[PDB]
Structure formats: C-alpha cells, structure tokens
Design a protein around this ligand. Sequence first.
Ligand code: MG
Ligand code: MG
Ligand code: ZN
Ligand code: ZN
Lengths: 156, 156
Amino acid sequence: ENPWLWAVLVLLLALSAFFSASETAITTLYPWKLKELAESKNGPFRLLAEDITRFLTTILVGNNLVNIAATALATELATQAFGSAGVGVATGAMTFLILFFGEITPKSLAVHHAEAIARLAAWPIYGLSVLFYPVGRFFSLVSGGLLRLLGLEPRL
Amino acid sequence: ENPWLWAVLVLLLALSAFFSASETAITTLYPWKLKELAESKNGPFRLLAEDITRFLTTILVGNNLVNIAATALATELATQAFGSAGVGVATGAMTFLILFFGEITPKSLAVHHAEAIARLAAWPIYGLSVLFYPVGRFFSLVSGGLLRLLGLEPRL
Ligand SMILES: [Mg+2]
Ligand SMILES: [Mg+2]
Ligand SMILES: [Zn+2]
Ligand SMILES: [Zn+2]
C-alpha cells in the first residue's frame, strides 16, 4: 500500500468519471445543439459534431481501460492484504466506487454542464482517439466479420 | 489456475455479454416497437415497456459487477503467476476480452436479434432487479443529493 498506488487508483477513477461525463455531455448535446455550437466557433464543437463516432468509440475504449486498470490494481492490493478473499473485497469496493464515482455521479453532473464538459474534453479525447479509435474500429470490424461467419448476422 | 476458476471467468464474460446485448436489444426496440409488442402479448414486452428504467438500471449494475468480478479474478490469476507485472497483463487481457466479447460483439449481435434477446432476457433481469434496481436508485439519489450539496446541480 504505497502512497503512489492509492493516488494512481484515485487518478484512474477520475479518468473514468472524465470519460463517462464526456460521453453524457456529448450525447445530450447531439445532434441539434452540437451543430449550433459547431456553426459558431471555436473550436471543439465542430470537431465533435463532424466525427461523433470517433469520440464515443474512444470513450468506450478509454472508460473500460481505466475501470479495468483500477480494478486490477485494487485487486492486487486486496489480495496481498487478504488473500483469496481479497477478490471479493475488491469486487465489492470497486463496484461501488466505479458505479458511484466513475459512472453515476459524472453522468448526472454532465447533463447540467454538458457544454462546458464537451468543450474541455474534446481535445484530450481527440488526442487519445489517434490510438483508441483505430483499436475500437478494428474490434468492431472483426466482431461483425465473426458474427457473419457464424451466421448470426446477415451475410456479406 | 484451477479448471473451475477458468469456467467462472468464462461465465462472468458470458454474463457481461448477456447484459450488454440486453441493453442494446431493449433500447433499440424502445419506444415504438416495444409498445407494439407490449399491446400484443405475452409477456415480457409489457413488463419491459412499463418500467424500462428498472431494466436499464439493473443492467448497468449487473454489467459493471460482472466486468469487475472477472477483472479481479483474472488479476488474482495473473499476479499469482507473474507478480506485480500481472496487473498490466490482466489489464491488457481483460480490456480485450471485455471490450470484444462483453461489449462490442454482444451489442452488434443484439441489433439484429433485438426481439428474441429482449424476450429471453426480460424475466432474468426482472428477477435481478429486485436487488439491483433499489441499489442503483439509492446510488443515483445519493449522488444527486451530493452534487446539489456541493452546488454542482441546481438547488433542491
Ligand atoms: Mg466511467
Ligand atoms: Mg457487457
Ligand atoms: Zn444556427
Ligand atoms: Zn398496435
């Protein structure tokens, strides 16, 4: 239980709140209010409006990554402290923290501050998208390919 | 690495796919097609149509719980195998598995089989909701209370 480790886990939960708040802010502005902000300038809203799929894909990848990285770190601490019971301890604690602070609280906050959050989140998420969006798109393309191979989606 | 442990982790990832597929099936039917199925009978669609918030809340809680429980178990195996590097190993592996099998593949599948999946998922999710929906609602009520206390949502 190094002090840095607790600060990394706090950092990861803050990133999870950042991603879930951004998702809600973006989608609640879309499409009509995002376009109006986009035709005025500047500048994140035109970026957001023109490629909302890049942003929501990046958030999906990013939100899962930080939630999984925080759970893994928390499980390392709990099982070193408690042994095999630490898996249940970390599951209970992290489900509360991720649900409360990484999901419910930031989404609730975002509906009331959607414009400010989208404005501030757009460029950091655009930067992450240079890696995350190709990754998510690869996954989705391969997944659809697999579903069609198996006959579970219409052939093409 | 007991055989049962790998089967529990597979089971958890299947539950994650069940929850994410159900979410997509439900929301893509809502509202117009869900009502049409609901006025015909029987019987899950009327249940779904009348209380969609109970179902989406239960899925939120359930999806996070199984993703966190699978990550915790996977991290137990990885760090017992590899030490502290196991945290990164489990984060990388579980992000791929949860994104690919627990999220992207089941959601893609659900848009093409939304009626069958909603029909089959409604009663199991209703059963879980007896515990999960009170839990999620408590969280959301307390979260909004906290945001208003802090001045981050309009006072009431
Ligand atoms: Mg989050
Ligand atoms: Mg899932
Ligand atoms: Zn205008
Ligand atoms: Zn009708």
